[PDB]
């Protein structure tokens, strides 16, 4: 333990813009020394819910690979990011497996994302034909057909555009304002170590 290297958690957490729900960006973290002391200590964290490891004994474990996912959802939907849940956003946008390892951090961000004039660049999928598998992403915007008759070209009857737009304004009460969500995933003790920090004394 010297230590010199530093993982870029800040770059994950202090980005100017996060991606939409249906196109969440996944970042790899490797070949660095991870320091969670600056992470958990920060003030405005709302829900630091952690599943496979205790949120304090992170610093004494060495991880084979770390992946970070970030997006922005409504406050009411934050409970749907836990494993085993079921809903519109837990079936059509993003779901976690039943054997999940790693854990999640969600914090309110109404001061930055929302605009008084109307922010219309945060989309989410509303229709789909079947439930998706864990950690799967799709981007295609093919016109979803509902009737038994085939559809093509432009929308109309039983031909709906599968993406709507969030309406984020400061006037909305608690439960509709955006909550920035970050999910960390990793594996334990089956491969050569790549990411871990020093143990304090």
């Amino acid at each position, epitope marked *: 333990p010297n230590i010199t290297n530093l993982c870029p958690f800040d770059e994950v957490f202090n980005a100017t813009r996060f991606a939409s729900v249906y196109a969440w960006n996944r970042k790899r973290i490797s070949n660095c020394v991870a320091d969670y002391s600056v992470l958990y200590n920060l003030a405005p964290f709302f829900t630091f819910k952690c599943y496979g490891v205790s949120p304090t004994k992170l610093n004494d474990l060495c991880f084979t690979n770390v992946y970070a996912d970030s997006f922005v959802i409504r406050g009411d939907e934050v409970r749907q990011i836990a494993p085993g849940q079921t809903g519109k956003i837990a079936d059509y946008n993003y779901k976690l497996p039943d054997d999940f390892t790693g854990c999640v951090i969600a914090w309110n961000s109404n001061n930055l994302d929302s605009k008084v004039g109307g922010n219309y660049n945060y989309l989410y999928r*509303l*229709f789909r034909k079947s439930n998706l598998k864990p950690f799967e992403r799709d981007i295609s915007t093919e016109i979803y057909q*509902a*009737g*038994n*008759k085939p559809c093509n070209g432009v929308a*109309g*009857f*039983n031909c*709906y*555009f599968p993406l*709507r737009s969030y309406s984020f304004r400061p006037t909305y009460g608690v439960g509709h304002q955006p909550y920035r969500v970050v999910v960390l995933s990793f594996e334990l003790l089956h491969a050569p170590a790549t990411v871990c920090g020093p143990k304090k004394s």
Partner: antibody
Amino acid sequence: QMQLVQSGPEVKKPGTSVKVSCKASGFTFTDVSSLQWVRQARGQRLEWIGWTVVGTGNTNYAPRFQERVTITTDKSTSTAYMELSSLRSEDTAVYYCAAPFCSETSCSDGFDLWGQGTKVTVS
Amino acid sequence: EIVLTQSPGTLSLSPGDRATLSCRASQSVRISYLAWYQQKPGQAPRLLISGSSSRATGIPDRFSASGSGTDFTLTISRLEPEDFAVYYCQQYANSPWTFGQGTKVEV
């Protein structure tokens, strides 16, 4: 059984605004269901108002009603609302709301269900 | 935007014969987005045939729809004493939807 019940007969004065509702019975608007509004006199041609999708919220209007009518939906209690402004004495008619059988996966292509009709008289 | 002219205006056949009705448009033609309703006196209209191949639930096998281009035709095998009412054509595909004019069938 599956059925839609509307409001009661209404009498209104010229100039003011009117507000009409129709709600399902043993039936939910879910997410794919549509709903169209029509207007019809005493034994004359059917007139079309507009239709809205409860899910995406996108709406459509006839060019004659582009300025003085509003269509609204409510998933909470599964109801549909029309708001009409600047009523006139020649608008005395019956208004209907229609929607097909439809539940959460995929559904029909014809306006099967129809309302009981509410008489709106202006004088 | 589109208009659906109906014909003939009035039809009068004995109960038991086959009857036919036609409605035609002028602008762009769509096939599977046509429906035929009937309005009993004083009550809301009900769906009979839609999509030219799928009938409504509970409607008997008597009615039959067809038509490919501008013209569309509805055929009734026989006239039961309750089958006397007005008929309307409707389309969904094109610009703001419009209804037909209304034809009556007599005995």
